[PDB]
Amino acid sequence: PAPLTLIGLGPMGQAMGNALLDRGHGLTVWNRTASRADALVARGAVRAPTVAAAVAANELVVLSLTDYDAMYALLGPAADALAGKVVVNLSSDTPEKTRAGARWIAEHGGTLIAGGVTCPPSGIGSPESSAFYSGPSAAFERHRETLRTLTRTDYRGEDPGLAALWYQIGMVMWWNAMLGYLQAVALADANGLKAADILPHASDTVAGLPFFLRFYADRIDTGHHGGDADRLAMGTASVEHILHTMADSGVDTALPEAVVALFRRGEAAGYAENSFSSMVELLKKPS
Amino acid sequence: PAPLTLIGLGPMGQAMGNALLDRGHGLTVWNRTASRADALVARGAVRAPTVAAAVAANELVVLSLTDYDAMYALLGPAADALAGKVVVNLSSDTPEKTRAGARWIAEHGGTLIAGGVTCPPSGIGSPESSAFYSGPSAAFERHRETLRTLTRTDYRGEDPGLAALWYQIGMVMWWNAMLGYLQAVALADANGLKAADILPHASDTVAGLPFFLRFYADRIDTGHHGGDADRLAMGTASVEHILHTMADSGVDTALPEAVVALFRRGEAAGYAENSFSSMVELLKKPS
Ligand SMILES: NC(=O)C1=CN([C@@H]2O[C@H](COP(=O)(O)OP(=O)(O)OC[C@H]3O[C@@H](n4cnc5c(N)ncnc54)[C@H](OP(=O)(O)O)[C@@H]3O)[C@@H](O)[C@H]2O)C=CC1
Ligand SMILES: NC(=O)C1=CN([C@@H]2O[C@H](COP(=O)(O)OP(=O)(O)OC[C@H]3O[C@@H](n4cnc5c(N)ncnc54)[C@H](OP(=O)(O)O)[C@@H]3O)[C@@H](O)[C@H]2O)C=CC1
Ligand SMILES: Fc1ccc(F)c(C2=NCCC2)c1
């Protein structure tokens, strides 16, 4: 296993360093809050005295930060020592800001590989976990084996915005579902039910979603938005029932209103008798 | 096999009447649009000439209509024939609208059992299908074997609104995730990707949800919103990345703005360093 530097020891960076040490990588770590490296150092990781010494320790520099602005904040001061470094940035951001980070790293002699990890910290090091990757192909292939300690690698192409784009595509569904979980837990709590009580039914419900994803994928892709499978107005009534159920129980209705508002836009566009999938045509229009 | 009356012959009512005839129940049917009964009548079902005749024909009256307002419009003129009847209303509506329906049936001498069927019409009669049930237990247990012809019976309690409550709790996450899928498709299409291209990742994202449902269940229930797995402020950045990725790609931001606003309410209320799950405290009914 090759040596490498890991900068950023939040929940994902910690899980990353432990998986790299489990594999035997010679690991050099640095974190703004130095306290968070103590456990990794006790396992054998090398604590870098500064962020510049961390970058200087290895060719491979893995970042796990909040966004790409944090990369400039951490790497900016010693940016003149980034020449010849491979920076694998595993931080979420937009495709545009991901490309800007790649341009900035190139200006200073390094090369950036963009990554999007699709697993929680407990999934790091597990072969069922995956991460999108995009950036220079030669630099990626050269360090793929090291990156495969963390997750399976899904290389998407040269453009760094690709891995970020694929990450956001899955994350918009993920956050939508998880906030709906909190909304369902909030409704349950208003009626004397715990998250543990609704957990089996909530799990059963989302576990059946892939069949609907497959059913509607090919319908959306051929432009088949006919109301033969479902009628949008019937979905409006369904989401109106959710909203008013929430309101009757005194639970917040900000997100249920937003969902109802989109169905109302669907009906305002004349899609009442078409499938609810027709709202993808509204969602494609800007603003 | 006990005889019963079925009113409401949409796709759900059709599958129900067929399942009842399959098992051998004597079936009296009525629908506002009489021609919808043609196939069931040719199978052996008895066509009632009027809704009043339908209600008078049997003690058990199963309803598969749009909502509870449709029950008042339909059963109103016949409200006197309701004395001694057990009305099993399988129409989806809010818990409060269901409870008002149960009081209105009681005012006219009947008893309402509320059902929440969690399967499409093709699931009616199949062994793994299920439906929540609520209402007076004795009247339910007297007709439980007949109802078990349609789905598994999941009795939830005496309060008539409980079946609707459990139905709405599951639908919250379903519509949130499916609308998030449409958002992901729109973003994908704006960047040259079809729904078929993102279907595997969207299925992986959805299928991994039960892990997070179980992970945050007891943490929410015990009030443990520690940031050991995630910080809310990191989630705020993540959903802002989605929002601005949508804007950068010229697609709609209505739902992403609503998601960002909730995270910012979490930060505004002092939860920036807690898990994102702590936003359930903002969604919960007051005091
Ligand atoms: N948490 C999860 O389950 C998942 C998150 N991700 C993504 O992975 C990334 C890592 O997130 P996560 O591990 O949760 O942790 P956080 O984003 O909460 O923090 C990660 C690290 O960023 C550092 N940091 C943030 N801002 C600055 C700054 N201005 N200057 C210096 N250091 C800074 C923190 O330093 P310090 O320790 O000093 O605070 C910390 O070590 C995010 O972009 C996230 O979207 C992807 C997969 C899943
Ligand atoms: N996938 C599904 O279909 C599922 C449906 N459900 C719930 O089951 C219920 C019925 O389902 P489904 O058959 O699909 O619904 P439909 O809306 O297709 O059927 C509505 C039925 O109610 C009748 N009706 C509506 N309004 C009135 C009125 N004002 N007066 C008299 N009759 C009226 C219609 O009669 P007419 O024929 O004359 O129009 C028809 O028989 C709904 O509440 C639905 O949400 C539950 C889960 C799954
Ligand atoms: F921002 C967050 C917060 C909590 C999380 F579990 C995540 C994850 N990304 C992929 C699923 C886990 C991201």
Named by the residue before each, gaps in chain A exceeding 2.5 A from C to N are none
- Angle B249-B252-B254 from CA coordinates, rounded to 5°: 135
Residues 3-32 of chain A with CB under 8 A from chain B are 10-11
How many whole angstroms from A119 Cα to the centroid of ligand 3?
Answer: 7
Q: Pairing state of beta strands B130-134 and B111-117?
A: antiparallel
Ligand 2 in reach of B97 Cβ (< 6 A): no
Q: Residue B243: how many CB atoms within 10 A of its CB?
A: 21
Experiment used for this model: X-ray
Pocket probe mutation, ligand 1, options A31, A65, A67, A69, max atoms within 8 Å of Cβ: A65
Give chain A's end-to-end CA distance (angstroms, integer): 48
Q: Determine the distance separating the centroid of ligand 2 and the alpha carbon of B200, expressed in angstroms.
A: 34
Tokens of A53: 């010494």
Q: Which string of DSSP letters, residue by residue, matches chain A?
A: ---EEEE--SHHHHHHHHHHHHHT--EEEE-SSGGGGHHHHHTTPEEPSSHHHHHHH-SEEEE--SSSHHHHHHHSTTGGG-TT-EEEE-----HHHHHHHHHHHHHTT-EEEEEEE-S-GGGTT-TT-EEEEES-HHHHHHHHHHHHHHSEEEEEES-THHHHHHHHHHHHHHHHHHHHHHHHHHHHHHTT--HHHHHHHHHHHHHTHHHHHHHHHHHHHTT---TTS--HHHHHHHHHHHHHHHHHTT---HHHHHHHHHHHHHHHTT-TTS-GGGHHHHHTS--
**Taking the CB of residue A128, how many other CB atoms lie within 10 A of it?**
10
Look at the block and give the residue holding tokens 């956050």.
Answer: A175
Residues B279 and A182 sit within 8 Å (Cβ to Cβ): yes
CA A188 from centre of chain: 28
Q: How many whole angstroms separate alpha carbon B178 and alpha carbon A277?
A: 9
Of B177, B211, B216, the CB nearest to A176: B177
| A130 and B CB contact within 8 Å | yes
**DSSP structure string for B212-240:** HHHHHHHHHHTT---SSS--HHHHHHHHH
**Structure letter (DSSP) for residue B161:** T
Q: Does A196 touch chain B (CB under 8 A)?
A: yes
Cα–Cα dist A50/B219, whole Å: 36
Q: Is A140 on the interface with B (CB under 8 A)?
A: no
**Nearest partner of A121 among A207, A285, A10, A278, judged by Cα:** A10
Both tokens assigned to A191:
């009626």
| B238 CA: nearest ligand 3 atom | 1
HSE (CB half, 13 Å, CA atoms) of B49?
0
The per-residue DSSP string of B233-283 comes to: HHHHHHHHHHHHHHHHTT---HHHHHHHHHHHHHHHTT-TTS-GGGGHHHH
> Amino acid identity, residue B168?
Q
Q: Closest approach of chain A CAs to the CA of B58, in angstroms?
A: 30
Cα B106 to Cα B136: distance, rounded to the nearest angstrom: 11
By the 8 A CB rule, do A149 and A137 touch?
A: no
Q: Which residue has the tokens 């149960």?
A: B102
Per DSSP, the residues of A229-252 read S--HHHHHHHHHHHHHHHHHTT--
What tokens appear for A258 in the block?
A: 């937003």
**Cβ pair A19, A150 in contact under 8 A:** yes
CA pair distance B238, A176, nearest whole angstrom: 12
Q: Phi/psi zone of residue B223: left (φ > 0), alpha (ψ -120 to 50 degrees), beta?
A: left
Q: Which atom of ligand 2 is nearest to the CA of B93?
A: 43
Based on its alpha-carbon atoms, the radius of gyration of chain B, rounded to whole angstroms, reads 23
CA dihedral B226, B227, B232, B238 (to 10 degrees): -150
Q: What would the two tokens of residue A280 be?
A: 């993808």
Q: Would the CB of B237 count as within 6 Å of ligand 2?
A: no
Q: How many CB atoms sit inside 10 A of residue A224's CB?
A: 13
The beta-carbon neighbor of A280 closest among B175, B186, B246 is B186
Helix (H) or strand (E) holding B156: strand B152-157
Tokens standing for A250?
A: 């005194």
Q: Is residue A152 a contact partner of residue A131, using CB atoms and an 8 Å limit? A: yes
Is the CB of residue A22 less than 8 Å from the CB of residue A40? no
Q: Is the CB of B230 under 6 A from ligand 3?
A: yes
Distance CA A80, CA A285 (A): 43
Assess B259–A contact: CB distance below 8 Å, yes or no: yes
Interface test with chain A among B179, B204, B265, B279, by most A beta carbons within 10 Å: B179
Amino acid at B83: A
For residues B49 and B26, the answer to whether their CB atoms sit within 8 Å is: no
Cα of B234 vs centre of ligand 3, distance in Å, is: 9
Give the separation between CA B79 and CA B159, rounded to whole angstroms.
22
Burial B172-181 (b: 16+ CB within 10 A, else e): bbbbbbbbbb
The answer to whether A33 faces chain B, any CB pair under 8 Å, is no
Closest protein CA for atom 4 of ligand 3? B230
* CA-based R_g, chain A, Å: 23
Pairing relationship of beta strands B46-47 and B27-30 according to DSSP bridges: parallel
Residue B208 CA to ligand 1 centre (angstroms): 22
How close, in Å, is residue A35 to chain B by CA atoms? Answer: 14
Two tokens at B226? Answer: 């520690």
